[PDB]
Design brief:
Shape of chain A: elongated
Subunit structure (chain B): Homotrimer, with large domains that extend into the periplasm, interacts with AcrA and TolC. AcrA may be required to stably link this protein and TolC. Interacts with AcrZ. Part of the AcrA-AcrB-AcrZ-TolC efflux pump.
Largest sheet of chain A: none
Strand content of chain A: under 5%
Family (chain B): Belongs to the resistance-nodulation-cell division (RND) (TC 2.A.6) family.
Protein name (chain B): Multidrug efflux pump subunit AcrB
Function (chain B): AcrA-AcrB-AcrZ-TolC is a drug efflux protein complex with broad substrate specificity that uses the proton motive force to export substrates.
Oligomer: part of a larger assembly
Organism (chain B): Escherichia coli (strain K12)
Number of strands of chain A: 0
Structural class of chain A: mainly alpha
Radius of gyration of chain A: 15 Å
Chain lengths: ~50, ~50
């Protein structure tokens, strides 16, 4: 429905689905095809 | 926390005469009427 970007979907998956799946019966390892959100601080050297 | 999510454990029993399965179904029925984003699970003796 065009409400979430890829980045968004990946954070949703990382933050709400991956841990449960990874503890599910018979599941060995789980690879996330994307990345959870972090608080990103993008520094500007000029302003520093 | 339960299975990694914030939770609150609730205990109770079947009213005199009625069965545990009956009471659980009711609880599930009541739980389906809760605000958006609130789920439930059974644990311990009720998992069993």
């Amino acid at each position: 429905d065009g409400t979430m970007t890829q980045e968004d979907i990946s954070d949703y998956v990382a933050a709400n689905m991956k841990d449960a799946i990874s503890r599910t019966s018979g599941v060995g390892d789980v690879q996330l095809f994307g990345s959870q959100y972090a608080m990103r601080i993008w520094m500007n050297p000029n302003e520093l | 926390r339960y299975n990694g999510l914030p939770s609150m454990e609730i205990l109770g029993q079947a009213a005199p005469g009625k069965s545990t399965g009956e009471a659980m179904e009711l609880m599930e029925q009541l739980a389906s009427k809760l605000p958006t984003g609130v789920g439930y699970d059974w644990t311990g003796m009720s998992y069993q």
